Amino acid sequence: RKANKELEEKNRMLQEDPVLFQLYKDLVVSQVISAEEFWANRLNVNATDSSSTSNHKQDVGISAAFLADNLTSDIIESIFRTYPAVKMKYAENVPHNMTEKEFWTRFFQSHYFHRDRLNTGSKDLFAECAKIDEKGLKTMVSLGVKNPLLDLTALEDKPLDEGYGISSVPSASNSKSIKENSNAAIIKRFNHHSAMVLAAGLRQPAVKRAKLQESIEYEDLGKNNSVKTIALNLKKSDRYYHGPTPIQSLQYATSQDIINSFQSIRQEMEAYTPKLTQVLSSSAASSTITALSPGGALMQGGTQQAINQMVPNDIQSELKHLYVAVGELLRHFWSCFPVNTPFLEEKVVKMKSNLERFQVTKLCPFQEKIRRQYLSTNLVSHIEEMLQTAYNKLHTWQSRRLMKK
Amino acid sequence: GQVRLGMMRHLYVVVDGSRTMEDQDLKPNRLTCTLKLLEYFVEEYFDQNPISQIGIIVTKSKRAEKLTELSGNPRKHITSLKKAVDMTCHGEPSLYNSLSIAMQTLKHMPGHTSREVLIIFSSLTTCDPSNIYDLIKTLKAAKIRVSVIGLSAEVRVCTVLARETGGTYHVILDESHYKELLTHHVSPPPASSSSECSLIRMGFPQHTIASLSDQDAKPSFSMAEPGLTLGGYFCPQCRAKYCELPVECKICGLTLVSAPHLARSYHHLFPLDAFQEIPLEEYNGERFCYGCQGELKDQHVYVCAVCQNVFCVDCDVFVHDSLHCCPGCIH
Amino acid sequence: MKLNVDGLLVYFPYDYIYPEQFSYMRELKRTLDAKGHGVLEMPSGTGKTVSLLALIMAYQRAYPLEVTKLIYCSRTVPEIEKVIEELRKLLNFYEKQEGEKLPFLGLAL
Amino acid sequence: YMESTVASWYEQGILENIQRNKLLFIETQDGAETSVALEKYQEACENGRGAILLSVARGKVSEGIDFVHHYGRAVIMFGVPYVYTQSRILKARLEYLRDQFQIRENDFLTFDAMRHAAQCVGRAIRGKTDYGLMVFADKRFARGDKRGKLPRWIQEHLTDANLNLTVDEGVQVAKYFLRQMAQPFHREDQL
Amino acid sequence: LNLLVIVVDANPIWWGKQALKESQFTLSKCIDAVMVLGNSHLFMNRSNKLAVIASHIQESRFLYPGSKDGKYELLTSANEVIVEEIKDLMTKSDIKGQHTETLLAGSLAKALCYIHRMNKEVKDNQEMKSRILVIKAAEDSALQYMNFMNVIFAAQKQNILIDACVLDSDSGLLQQACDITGGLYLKVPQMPSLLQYLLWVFLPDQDQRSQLILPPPVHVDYRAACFCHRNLIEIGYVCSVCLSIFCNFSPICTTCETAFKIS
Ligand SMILES: [Zn+2]
Ligand SMILES: [Zn+2]
Ligand SMILES: [Zn+2]
Ligand SMILES: [Zn+2]
């Protein structure tokens, strides 16, 4: 059982697959495989179902604001990633002047889920933060990342040297009323939300110049299509012409013999239409029918399939469980064998492999005392042969380690 | 076949889970049409090379789901494609999630074996949890080739991903055009200089029967819904019964390939001689086409590079498609 | 590619030949032959500065005395920078075609 | 008009559908916000997500910046550019032009609007080997008074079948054109 | 509508030795058996079509391309054209030291393309089943193996079954061709009685063959010998660059002449 946690992980793997559970039970009785080792094999996979996550790249807060209905809906998780400040405020309020249940009461409170104030829905507060932070990024903050260019005022020469020229209304602050002013605020929220969606995903002349560098030149001009695909040249085409299967017939004769055979075949072909071959054909047919018919001699028919047992399908299922358990053990022994590195640690790993192989052979002997004695079948001999092959490789490794010593 | 080709190819197929596949831009719904063409492509890919294997992953709602495990059997992939038609296929697929899992699976596979990923997108818009550009840099570091096929759309991001990994971007202008792209995918691409090339040990398992009428036969069961396996191929390294001859032994890690399968891939090593086509008879040596021993019914002459034997259009098309040899040269 | 105006050979860095470009060059040459301002409509897809500079430079090489100086005016400062960069690329191709050293003076204000 | 149209679109179930198809990057009166919207529009195209930017043809900012072909595959013109708040200065100039020369006041107004509109329309094409779509949503273009003011090279590309297209028919023709240009062009084909 | 194509490997030297032996079976008897089988195939279904091809040592000739005795006119005409073709090819032969054995692969390649042109001629709405019958008396050639393998793959791609009967000795190339195609492989002990064997198994249509009981095709072993020293190995290293079997690992691969990369 090792660690109570390792044992629970092994139990979960056994629960997932019925065939695996039977193999695990046989190994536990044998003691060939540790519960921790079984848990490690179960946890020997790639990543998770969603691996990293499933965050959106557009309209993350505008996916289903107060329309889908903490860590409940994936929508609200994407919204938390989209606005870090809103997520931080929610986390701080969780035990301070508010609870999670209280936050849910606020979520469905009137003027929010009911959309009776600030229109929108559950992204109303998010949009308020967006507009405010966009105005702050246009006043207090600016373009933090600004190199040779990558800016706005610096990108367009120097801001707007419009030192009282003729055009200025454009940004007419003194004139913003309510309807048009509200629409301008909505544009600010959308622009900030797009930046926030980019922020959720990852936890200008300079851009144009980089694109120009990518466009300049070609991959073919650099090298070719797939980098530098090396040419393939074969010194001997003759070796391929020769067949791996052994030559069935290989015989020759003298040139004079070839002339004699040609003369006889020329005479034989000219003779034709014997007609009276019926007597020979009738005698030949009588011999052929007996061989061609399934009854009688000269017929190729085997497939005895005489499995005298109680329930053969159940016996086959028991063998499959034994094969799965033995195969997993053989895979572990082969991994240890691959890393030879003849040393003291390698000898310890080889001793562990031997112990597990011997315990698997004891399990095969117990299986022989089961359905190979009661039902007189379960041919565990093949499973024993696979274990013997692993033992033979272990014996070869021991010989190599002795030669190294 | 002058360029180096990968004898073992772990091609990976990614199918879009977007609602756009459900929308019928073509006369049939795109998801069903693409899956049917993929089924033909999977069968052709396995037929062209038995050693090469395919793995299918479908991303739905930005979550990666493995439609089929990488395997040498085409039928299992075809069954998974039928299941994909059954699936809702609703919500934007995640390019990042599928690529990350596929790349991790490829990392386990040996560097010398060619590792490739094929992606089909029905929507120009791409939605993923993590930035696509960061993943493309990771793919460049890994020994993986990525080819992206857009459906009736051209995407700069997909082209950039393909060029960086050495893959070729493709556009599905027509269903027939998509079949041609799949035929190009079935053919092995030239091996990159970065890709490792090394001799690989091969185990050849001769089939073992039940000796003489079950003479002390080693009756088995399922050693990678079976019965009593008395007559089966044995892995040479571990002497274990195996149901299918072209299956890599899981415990040994040693690929098992039959001699006829190697003979099939011999044609790939040497390119077929091109046949020059002239509408004019041009004093043709033989009125009868050499291949079918019959006079041409149309004014087309095919001339081989060396033998220069006459070939009719039907013979020329068949020779490239299946024969993979010049009949006049064989004589 | 070299283009003959019958007074000089015009060298194109792109080396791309178009029927519209050939028709434009003939019409522009007629405008160049007869002094008197004039308005010419050129398609947006072709670069205005690259096409105009190549013919003007060839005419200036053929007839240096006629034009003491060349002045280019652009509405925006980035366009002024683009004209100078395109002129520099055109000069480099001209330098490869002619003598190894081909000094030219270009100013952006 | 653009702000008013957006407000009407938000009330109807149209703007939300447009947002799903493409990220919205409406231009703003503030210069810094307009530059941020343009940069965000470029970033979405690099990402491959659909990006839509709403801009004013009359505004000088649109004239100053030409959209890159990758950033803006298709350019759409709605209506004919006009100034609602235009002062008496333009009207006085039109009368002065009539007295000094021989220019029709209506013809000058149509020509002035068209030269700005044509410049905005012709930003999709930056190179000979490029694919671009130009769409006009105004009936006057169909009448042809606007078409005559438009440059001759654009008129040669324009077709009677293209003129007065139905909204569904125009979108279908554009989709067919994109499928035809999806396959890569070749240098020999240009020659 | 079933197409049966019969390809016979004819070696003048081997057939001449049979004539010198003076055994009752003769090359003439073998062709007579093929013609009787062909008449029966046409007789059972008018739609069914018969094509007969004979392989010479250096070339392949297609034999197939009234009721005087009351025999069906079409059967009589088909037999007459075959009789003229077979006699002309057999009477005159050219002795070559390089190629004393007839090329079955060349004849098979011609047959497969001929079936392909005929299939194109056949209307798409009507369905045609294509099967090949091969009779081989010539010895197998190691050089012909590369050409032979490609023709088997062409038959597999075109889904044409190949059925082969061997008069004297089973051929490894021929048995492998039947195994890949899935066509039945049979060995005939008595050469004079070959016609009776053809009628029982080869003559019936694929639907008829399932209904009747026919002897199972012989299992084909798979043998891998390295071409380096022509020696069979249970395990052979295969070079990635040239796909060539090696009895033992080689630092430098002779077949492609490239040097294996060593870490
Ligand atoms: Zn093994
Ligand atoms: Zn032919
Ligand atoms: Zn040839
Ligand atoms: Zn090699």
DSSP A198-245: HHHH---HHHHHHHHHHHSS-HHHHS-SSSS--B---S-HHHHHS-SS
What torsion do the CA atoms of E154, E157, E159, E160 make, to the nearest 10 degrees? Answer: 0
> Residue C38 — φ and ψ, nearest 5°?
110, 155
Phi, psi of C74, rounded to the nearest 5 degrees? -125, 145
- Closest to E238 in 3D by CA, of D83, E228, E15, B86: E228
Please tell me the distance from the alpha carbon of residue A394 to that of residue A338, in angstroms, as a whole number: 11
- Write the residue in A201, A237, A330 that is nearest to B238 by C-beta: A330
Distance, in Å, from the CA atom of A355 to the CA atom of A299, rounded to the nearest integer, reads 51
- What is the distance between the alpha carbons of residues E143 and E86, in angstroms, rounded to a whole number? 27
Length of chain A: 405
Residue pair E42/E48 in contact (Cβ under 8 Å)? The answer is yes
Q: Rounded to a whole number, what is the distance in Å from the CA of A296 to chain E's nearest CA?
A: 13
Q: In B122-258, at which residue ranges do the beta strands (DSSP E only) sit?
A: 145-150, 170-171, 200-203, 207-208, 232-234, 241-242
CB-hemisphere CA count at 13 Å for E78? 22
**What is the rounded (10 degree) CA torsion for B208, B212, B215, B219?**
40
**SS3 assignment, position E180:** helix
As a whole number of Å, the end-to-end CA separation of chain C is: 32
Determine the distance in angstroms separating the CA of E133 from the nearest CA of chain A, rounded to an integer. Answer: 18
Local structure of E205: helix, strand or coil: coil
| Antiparallel, parallel or unpaired: β B145-150 and B170-171 | parallel
Q: Is B306 helix (H, G, I), strand (E, B) or coil?
A: coil
- Give the distance (Å) from ligand 3 centre to CA of residue B312: 14
CB neighbour list of residue D85: distance below 8 Å, 6 or more residues apart: none
For A320-349, b where at least 16 C-beta lie within 10 A, e where not — what string?
bbbbbbbbbbbbbbbebbeeeeeeeebeeb
Burial class (CB in 10 A: 0-12, 13-18, 19+), A187: buried
Please tell me the distance from the alpha carbon of residue B229 to that of residue B219, in angstroms, as a whole number.
Answer: 6
Experimental method: cryo-EM
Three-state DSSP string of E51-77:
EEEEECCCCEEECCCCCCCCCCHHHHH
Q: Which of residues 40-99 of E touch B (CB under 8 A)?
A: 58-62, 65
Instruction: Show the CA angle centred on residue E37, arms to residues E34 and E41, nearest 5°.
Output: 135
Biggest CA pair distance of chain C: 37
Q: Give the Cα separation of E172 and E225 in Å (integer).
A: 14
List of chain A residues whose C-beta atoms are within 8 Å of the C-beta of residue D24: 190
Count Cβ atoms below 10 Å from residue A246 Cβ, excluding itself. Answer: 12
Ligand number with the minimum distance to the CA of B316: 2
Closest partner CB to D29 (pick from A160, A167, A171): A171
Quick check: is E222 in a domain? no
Pairing of strands B232-234, B241-242: antiparallel
The amino acid that residue A211 corresponds to is: K
Q: Which residues lie at CB < 5 A from ion ligand 3? A: B 304, 306-307, 326, 328-329
Nearest to E15 by CA among A262, B232, B245: A262
Residue that the structure tokens 């009330």 belong to: D11
Strand order, beta sheet including E245-246: B200-203, E235-238, E245-246
In a domain, E218, yes or no: no
Q: Is D36 helix (H, G, I), strand (E, B) or coil?
A: helix
- Domain, as residue range, for E188: 1-204
* Number of C-beta neighbours around residue A313 at 10 A: 9
Chain centroid, CA D43 distance in Å:
21
Nearest to B32 by CA among B83, B70, B94: B83
Backbone phi, psi, residue D163, to 5°: -65, 140
- Residue D87 CB contacts under 8 Å (≥ 6 apart), including other chains: none
Q: Is E220 a domain residue?
A: no
**Per-domain residue ranges for chain D?**
1-182
Amino acid at E209: R
Q: Which residue has the tokens 């599905």?
A: B172
Q: How far is C-alpha E53 from the geometric centre of its chain's CA atoms?
A: 10
Determine the Cα–Cα distance for residues A308 and A315; give it in Å rounded to an integer: 12
What single-letter DSSP state applies at residue D124? Answer: S
Compute φ and ψ for B146, nearest 5 degrees: -115, 125
Mind telling me how many Å the CA of B298 is from chain A's nearest CA? 36
Distance CA(B302)–CA(B278), nearest Å, equals 7
Could you tell me the sign of the dihedral formed by the alpha carbons of A233, A234, A235, A238, in that order? negative
Q: With contacts defined as CB-CB under 8 Å, which chain B residues touch E65?
A: 293-294
Tell me how far CA of residue B287 lies from CA of B291, B330, E81, in angstroms: 12, 21, 21
Number of Cβ within 10 Å of residue B125's Cβ equals: 22
Cα A152 off chain centre by: 45
Are E60 and E114 within 8 A, CB to CB?
A: no
Closest CA to E147 of A237, B308, B202, B289: A237
E13 chain-A contacts, CB cut-off 8 A: 253, 257-258, 261-262
What is the dotted CATH code of the domain comprising D1-182?
3.40.50.300
C-alpha span between B59 and B14 (Å, rounded): 8
Nearest residue on chain B to E55, judged by CA atoms?
A: B331
Q: Which residues contact E160 (CB under 8 A, 6 or more apart)?
A: E112, E115, E130, E131, E132, E181
Q: Cβ distance B255 to B311 under 8 Å?
A: no
User: Pick from D79, D89, D88, D136: which is nearest to D113 by CA?
Assistant: D79
Q: Is the dihedral of CA B138, B20, D25, A53 positive or negative?
A: negative
Contact B4 A382 (CB under 8 A): no
Place of tokens 């438009």: D150
Separation of first and last alpha carbons in chain A = 37
Distance, in Å, from the CA atom of D161 to the CA atom of D164, rounded to the nearest integer, reads 7
What is the residue whose two structure tokens read 């294996």? Answer: E260
Contact (CB<8Å) E260/B245: no
3-state secondary structure at position A395: helix
| B26 interface with D at CB cutoff 8 Å | no
- Name the β-bridge partners of E2: E129
- The first and second tokens of residue D108, run together, are 């000058």
Alpha-carbon gap, residue B207 to B229, rounded angstroms: 12
DSSP letter at D23 equals E
CA proximity to B17, closest of B53, B58, B51:
B58
CB-based contact B174:B136 (threshold 8 Å): no
Q: Residue C11 has which token pair? A: 């060298």
Q: What counts of helices (H) and strands (E) characterise chain C?
A: 3, 2
Residue E118 lies in a domain: yes
What residues form DSSP beta bridges with B289? B294
Strands E60-62 vs D133-136: parallel, antiparallel or unpaired: unpaired
Q: Which residues of E touch B292 (CB under 8 A)?
A: 110, 113-114, 117
| Total of domains in chain E | 1
Q: Is the Cα dihedral E246, E250, E254, E255 positive or negative?
A: positive
Which tokens in the block code for residue E73? 């006119």
Sign for the CA dihedral angle at A236, A241, A247, A250 comes to negative
What does the alpha-carbon distance between residue C79 and residue C87 come to, in Å, rounded to a whole number? 12
Inspect the structure and tell me whether chains B and C have 3 or more CB pairs less than 8 Å apart. no
Residue with token string 């910046």:
D65
CA-to-CA distance for C57 and C69, rounded, in angstroms?
11
Query: What does each C-alpha distance from A335 to A94, A105, B202, B250, E7 come to in angstroms?
Result: 50, 57, 18, 11, 53
User: b vs e for B31-67, b when ≥16 Cβ sit within 10 Å of the residue's Cβ?
Assistant: bbbbbbbbbebbebbbebbbbbbbbbbbbbbbbbbbb
Resolution of the experimental structure, in angstroms:
4.1
With tokens 């019925």, the residue in question is: A18
Q: Per DSSP, which regions of E79-226 are E strands?
A: 129-136, 161-166, 185-187, 225-226
